[PDB]
RNA sequence: AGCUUUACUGCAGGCUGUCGCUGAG
RNA sequence: CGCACGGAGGCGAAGAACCACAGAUUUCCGAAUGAGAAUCUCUAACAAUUGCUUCGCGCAAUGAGGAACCCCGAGAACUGAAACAUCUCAGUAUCGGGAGGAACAGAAAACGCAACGUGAUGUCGUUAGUAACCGCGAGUGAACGCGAUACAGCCCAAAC
């Protein structure tokens, strides 16, 4: 909430989540804030996911500002445990990253835009 | 590359700046309405917790503890005292608020033992510290190498004997040389002069 | 004396319970006599009735009844 | 005063402890034992409680 | 475990109740109720218990005055033991 | 030792300035 | 067949008594734990606080004791200063909390015989009534090093 500066329309969210599962089978993804973080740092990040229900918030506060100075596009997920399930994990995940999608690029490509457009 | 953690940490260098500032201005509110000892499922400072011995495992608990701010709550003398000993206002306790917190917490969880603790802020009248505790009886811990040590009998009630880290520090045991003549190997063995 | 361990063990879980209740009743009447200024006693016996009972019980424990 | 079943038992024990040292013990001990070093008179003494 | 009946309370007064009211007096265990005392007796002696009065004695023991049914005879019972 | 006071020295308590809680124009 | 040497009686060659280890039994109150209560009572019980959790007291923990010793907190006054306030008595007496068979300490952000040197920690001897403190009064008072004792070094957090 303190690091959330724009709300992602329920449906737009679905699209992002869909692209993730497909990217988890066509290409590569990063589960867990630590790995996500290093991606944004090692540039190897296309699109990153951040949950809206995380406590403590410290764990994620840095994602936005960090991404916003590395070009890497990022979108918000409302529930932490859907992101986990999407990434392919039993448990939930605070934030994940899509490293080289796969058959999800067009979608992602547009999501990246769709969001930029959502400011 | 910088671990994700390193950010959580760097953010607390100045708990009164940016996001962490507003975050505190918000939490403390829900905090000032919580109890004395509140078990919480996740550490507000993951870097620190993990650093001090935390581990998202079983038998590992955390709890936030508030303690009043200020000097000792002392009662004036009701019998003869020489001037030196008639003080009240400026007398302070020899055990830091952090240690006070580690104890209030440990007592709330009789079966557990204190592993460590760290600060998490303070408003105008109180201080909050989060305390990491351990179920010395859980097999998940009895089998973890980086922790099973705390199961030893001689580790029982360690916080009340000052074996905690904040304890050994508050005991003047930091330095190994000059200055620690009356602290090591023990305050009491040095006739309480440190 | 007028009862042994082996002999107590050569009984069946139903024979001891049987022997037990026997002694008790004997004991109880012994006491009844004493209570009424009993004289035709043989003190070394009312003492035994207690030890025997102990033994039968000790055994009911060991033998699993 | 109304007593309880517990109190009544204690008193009973006390009354009993307040008896002579059996005549025979004297002989059995060649008279080294004669006095009940615990005689408690109702008037002259005071029972706890 | 503890036994309900300790033994026959035998004294002049107990005799009277026996020879006059068909009553048998017993020294029983203090945790025993009247009903328990009743049963126990009808068993160890094979009779019919009509009524039972109890009293906690200054001896640390509980005395019970048991009255038998008109059929059974107190004297005849007590005689055998 | 109790007691007193414009005895000596201090300690509670009260009033007051300041700092922290403490932010917007 | 206790101390305990009486009387009556009994037990033991089916090896008793007696001693060693192991086991059985082991009332009520008692941390006292279903609830209450001057050791009893009333209608199934880990009361209470916790951990894990089949989220069910299901599996566990705590509580209390102990000669002193130990560790962490609270902390006098008589007294000495020939009065007395700092100082001293003394971090003593006493109080609160807690561990063990021993505790605590412990592998250098050390020492600083200043070195081309020592090498975790307790303790004992000495260093020394030295340095240092103090109405610079009365008093208070180490350490490094040295000789001994015994020696023992390791584990995470993070980077990947
Ligand atoms: Cl502890
Ligand atoms: Cl050296
Ligand atoms: K003084
Ligand atoms: Mg390892
Ligand atoms: Mg020591
Ligand atoms: Mg009498
Ligand atoms: Mg009555
Ligand atoms: Mg005077
Ligand atoms: Mg009770
Ligand atoms: Mg003087
Ligand atoms: Mg002088
Ligand atoms: Mg001194
Ligand atoms: Mg030195
Ligand atoms: Na505890
Ligand atoms: Na000091
Ligand atoms: Na009297
Ligand atoms: Na009797
Ligand atoms: Na006076
Ligand atoms: Na025993
Ligand atoms: Na349960
Ligand atoms: Na003097
Ligand atoms: Na004087
Ligand atoms: Na001075």
Curated annotation (Swiss-Prot), chain A:
Name of the protein: Large ribosomal subunit protein eL8
One GO BP annotation of this record: tRNA 5'-leader removal
Claim: Cytoplasm is one of the keywords in the record: yes
Cystine bridges: none
The organism's taxonomic lineage, starting at the top: Archaea, Methanobacteriati, Methanobacteriota, Stenosarchaea group, Halobacteria
Function: Multifunctional RNA-binding protein that recognizes the K-turn motif in ribosomal RNA, the RNA component of RNase P, box H/ACA, box C/D and box C'/D' sRNAs.
The entry's keywords: Cytoplasm, Ribonucleoprotein, Ribosomal protein, RNA-binding, rRNA-binding, tRNA processing
Self-association state and partner proteins as the record states: Part of the 50S ribosomal subunit. Interacts with protein L15e. Probably part of the RNase P complex.
Superkingdom of this protein's organism: Archaea
Primary gene name: rpl7ae
Record-level Gene Ontology MF annotations: ribonuclease P activity; rRNA binding; structural constituent of ribosome
Cellular localization per UniProt: Cytoplasm
Major place of residence: cytoplasm
Sequence similarity: Belongs to the eukaryotic ribosomal protein eL8 family.
Gene3D superfamilies from the UniProt entry: 3.30.1330.30
Any single Gene Ontology cellular-component annotation: cytoplasm
UniProtKB/Swiss-Prot annotation, chain C:
GO cellular component terms attached to this protein's record: cytosolic large ribosomal subunit
InterPro entries recorded: Ribosomal_protein_uL29, Ribosomal_uL29, Ribosomal_uL29_CS, Ribosomal_uL29_sf
One GO MF term attached to the UniProt entry: rRNA binding
Domain of life (superkingdom): Archaea
This protein's record includes keyword Mitochondrion: no
Pfam families documented for this protein: Ribosomal_L29
Keyword field: Ribonucleoprotein, Ribosomal protein, RNA-binding, rRNA-binding
Keyword Ribosomal protein appears in the UniProt entry: yes
GO BP terms, alphabetized: translation
Family label: Belongs to the universal ribosomal protein uL29 family.
Function: Stabilizes the tertiary rRNA structure within the 23S rRNA domain (domain I) to which it binds. Located at the polypeptide exit tunnel on the outside of the subunit.
Known partners and oligomeric status: Part of the 50S ribosomal subunit. Interacts with protein L23.
HAMAP family listed in its UniProt record: Ribosomal_uL29
Protein's recorded name: Large ribosomal subunit protein uL29
From Swiss-Prot, chain D:
GO molecular function annotations of the record: rRNA binding; structural constituent of ribosome
Example GO biological process: translation
Protein family per UniProt: Belongs to the eukaryotic ribosomal protein eL39 family.
Subunit structure of this chain's protein: Part of the 50S ribosomal subunit. Interacts weakly with protein L23.
Pfam families: Ribosomal_L39
Domain of life assignment: Archaea
Any single GO CC term annotated in Swiss-Prot or TrEMBL for this entry: ribosome
Keyword rRNA-binding: yes
Biological role stated in the UniProt entry: Binds to the 23S rRNA. Forms part of the polypeptide exit tunnel.
InterPro entries: Ribosomal_eL39, Ribosomal_eL39_CS, Ribosomal_eL39_dom_sf
Keywords tagged on the record: Ribonucleoprotein, Ribosomal protein, RNA-binding, rRNA-binding
Nuclease recorded as keyword: no
Protein name, as recorded: Large ribosomal subunit protein eL39
Curated annotation (Swiss-Prot), chain E:
Signal peptide: none
Keywords assigned: Ribonucleoprotein, Ribosomal protein, RNA-binding, rRNA-binding
UniProt keyword annotation of Disulfide bond present: no
A GO biological-process term: translation
Gene3D superfamilies in the record: 3.30.70.330
Transferase listed as a keyword: no
Gene Ontology cellular component list: ribonucleoprotein complex; ribosome
Any GO MF annotation of the entry: rRNA binding
Subunit and partners: Part of the 50S ribosomal subunit. Interacts with protein L29 and weakly with protein L39e.
NCBIfam families (UniProt xref): PRK14548.1 (NF011118), uL23_arch (TIGR03636)
Protein family membership: Belongs to the universal ribosomal protein uL23 family.
Protein name stated in the entry: Large ribosomal subunit protein uL23
Organism placement in taxonomy: Archaea, Methanobacteriati, Methanobacteriota, Stenosarchaea group, Halobacteria
């Amino acid at each position: 909430p303190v690091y959330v500066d724009f709300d992602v329309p329920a449906d737009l969210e679905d699209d992002a989540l869909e692209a993730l599962e497909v990217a988890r089978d066509t290409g590569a993804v990063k589960k867990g804030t630590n790995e996500t973080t290093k991606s944004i740092e090692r540039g190897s990040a296309e699109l990153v996911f951040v949950a809206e229900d995380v406590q403590p918030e410290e764990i994620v506060m840095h994602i936005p500002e960090l991404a916003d100075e590395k070009g890497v596009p990022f979108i918000f997920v409302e529930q932490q445990d859907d992101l986990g399930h999407a990434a392919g994990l039993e448990v939930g995940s605070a934030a994940a990253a899509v490293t080289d999608a796969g058959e999800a690029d067009a979608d992602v490509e547009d999501i990246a835009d769709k969001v930029e457009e959502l400011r | 590359a910088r671990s994700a953690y390193s950010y959580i940490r760097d953010a607390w260098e100045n708990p009164g700046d940016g996001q962490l500032a507003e975050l505190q201005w918000q939490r403390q509110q829900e905090w000032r309405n919580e109890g004395a000892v509140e078990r919480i499922e996740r550490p507000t400072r993951l870097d620190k917790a993990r650093s001090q011995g935390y581990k998202a495992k079983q038998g590992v608990i955390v709890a936030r503890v508030s303690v009043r701010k200020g000097s000792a709550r002392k009662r004036r003398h009701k019998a003869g005292r020489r001037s030196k000993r008639q003080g009240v206002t400026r007398i302070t306790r020899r055990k830091d608020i952090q240690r006070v917190a580690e104890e209030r917490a440990s007592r709330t969880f009789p079966n557990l033992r204190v592993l460590n603790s760290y600060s998490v802020g303070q408003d105008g009248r109180q201080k909050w510290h989060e305390v990491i505790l351990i179920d010395p009886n859980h097999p998940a811990i009895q089998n973890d190498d980086d922790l099973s040590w705390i199961c030893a009998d001689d580790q029982a009630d360690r916080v009340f004997r000052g074996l905690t880290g904040a304890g050994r520090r508050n005991r003047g045991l930091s330095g190994k040389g000059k200055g620690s003549e009356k602290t090591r190997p023990s305050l009491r063995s040095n006739g309480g002069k440190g | 004396t007028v009862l042994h361990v082996q002999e107590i063990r050569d009984m069946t879980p139903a024979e001891r319970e049987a022997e037990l209740d026997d002694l008790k009743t004997e004991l109880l009447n012994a006491r009844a006599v004493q209570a009424a200024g009993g004289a035709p006693e043989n003190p070394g016996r009312i003492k035994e009735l207690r030890k025997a009972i102990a033994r039968i019980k000790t055994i009911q424990g060991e033998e699993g009844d | 005063g109304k007593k309880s079943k517990a109190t009544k038992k204690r008193l009973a024990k006390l009354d009993n402890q307040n008896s002579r040292v059996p005549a025979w013990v004297m002989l059995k001990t060649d008279r080294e034992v004669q006095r009940n070093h615990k005689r408690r008179h109702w008037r002259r003494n005071d029972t706890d409680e | 475990s503890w036994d309900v009946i300790k033994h026959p309370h035998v004294t002049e007064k107990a005799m009277n109740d026996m020879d006059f009211q068909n009553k048998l007096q017993f020294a029983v265990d203090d945790r025993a109720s009247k009903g328990e005392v009743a049963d126990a007796v009808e068993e160890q002696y094979d009779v019919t218990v009509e009524q039972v009065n109890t009293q906690n004695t200054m001896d640390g023991e509980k005395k019970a005055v048991v009255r038998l049914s008109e059929d059974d005879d107190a004297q005849e019972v007590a005689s055998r033991i």
